[PDB]
Amino acid sequence: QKRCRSSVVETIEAPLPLVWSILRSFDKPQAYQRFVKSCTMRGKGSVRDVTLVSGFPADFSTERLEELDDESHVMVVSIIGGNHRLVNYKSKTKVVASPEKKTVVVESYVVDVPEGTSEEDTIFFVDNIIRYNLTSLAKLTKKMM
């Protein structure tokens, strides 16, 4: 099964504990993910049911919390169902404070390349979405503080 992987790295002008407090909230992706209309959650193993806003090329996602480490600031999510042509999707989020208060976030993932679309379009599609979310994260943190 054809597979692709990518990674998005961005620097956010906010302190680590602020940024992390938002990312770690598995049950509330809506806080910074514009395409999320609603999310209900049913620590590790937690499953969340996401509904997507109109205009987006999907209506739902079903995602499972694989790992949440509040010591090393890492989250591991995996999409286990959905309408979004994203099959066997599994992502890691790593948060670290900036050596300079600022935060760097690294979001990486693997997913099956869907039938009928190139690796490059699959990468572009997901990367683009992640940058939106990281952009909103920055906006939100800038507000909260």
């Binding site: 806080a31 514009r34 109109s54 090329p57 042509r85 683009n128 906006k139």
Partner: protein, 267 residues
């Protein structure tokens, strides 16, 4: 002897959806120019939330009106483009309750037509459509902004964007239309600039149909006009109503908005 104003019928429904994100603007006699009575009709298909569609319904005719009061001769393209860009600007500055990040993914198509005593002006941005029925013939007065429309594909790449098929041709894989009011996060790929047609009224004109893709995604131009044709043999509201019912009967799971303007003289 006959009536200067046209009989209009409107049907704008939620359909099988939970949220209504269509909106409709009906402003007959909305202005006069050189002692000529002008009319405004508009359909807006929202996405993300409803508020951009609603905003157009509340402002667009006003904005067009102010622009008309300063237009030279008959330069309607300039007038409509300015009006549409101004609408977008206002939106730039409710389900999502106007809150981030969700308000950062909202826009609307806008299809509008100013009907003067001599002309039909259609200003379109998005994939709603205006179709003229005349001599039985179905004549589209706008051309949908689809990301795979070949000229639209090229314009997007020239703005540095890309088109990806993902449940249809989509701008950046996301939006199913290449133009829209709002959606700043998708500028400059998706722009609010409308394309404008101007067509002379004839004695053969039957009616004008403005409608969201709730209608056109299942009912083609030729069968729309045919339904409207026989209803005219409120007749306009009978046509609007019959058209949306037809789209629902063809299992439309989308909001449906149909406007039917009667063009021939009466009373």
């Amino acid at each position: 002897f006959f009536s200067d104003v046209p009989k209009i019928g409107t049907t704008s429904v939620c359909g099988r959806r939970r949220d209504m994100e269509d909106a409709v603007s009906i402003h007959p006699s909305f202005l006069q120019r050189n002692s000529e009575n002008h009319h405004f009709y508009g359909v807006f298909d929202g996405h993300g939330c409803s508020h951009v569609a609603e905003k157009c319904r509340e402002r667009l005719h006003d904005i067009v009106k102010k622009e008309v009061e300063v237009m030279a001769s008959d330069e309607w393209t300039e007038t409509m483009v300015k009006s549409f860009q101004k609408m977008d600007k206002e939106v730039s500055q409710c389900r999502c309750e106007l809150q981030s990040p969700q308000c950062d993914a909202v826009g609307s198509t806008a299809v509008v037509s100013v009907v003067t005593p001599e002309k039909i002006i259609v200003s379109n941005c998005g994939d709603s459509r205006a179709v003229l029925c005349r001599n039985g013939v179905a004549i589209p007065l706008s051309v949908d902004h689809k990301p795979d429309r070949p000229d639209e594909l090229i314009r997007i790449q020239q703005a540095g964007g890309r088109v990806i098929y993902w449940d249809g041709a989509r701008v950046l894989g996301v939006l199913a239309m290449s133009r829209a009011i709002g959606d700043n996060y998708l500028k400059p790929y998706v722009i609010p600039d409308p394309e404008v047609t101007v067509t002379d009224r004839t004695d053969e004109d039957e009616c004008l149909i403005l409608a969201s893709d709730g209608l056109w995604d299942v009912v083609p131009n030729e069968t729309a006009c045919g339904v409207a044709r026989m209803c005219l043999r409120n007749a306009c509201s009978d046509a609007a109503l019959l058209l949306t019912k037809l789209a629902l009967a063809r299992q439309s799971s989308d909001n449906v908005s149909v406007v039917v303007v009667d063009l021939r003289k009466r009373r």
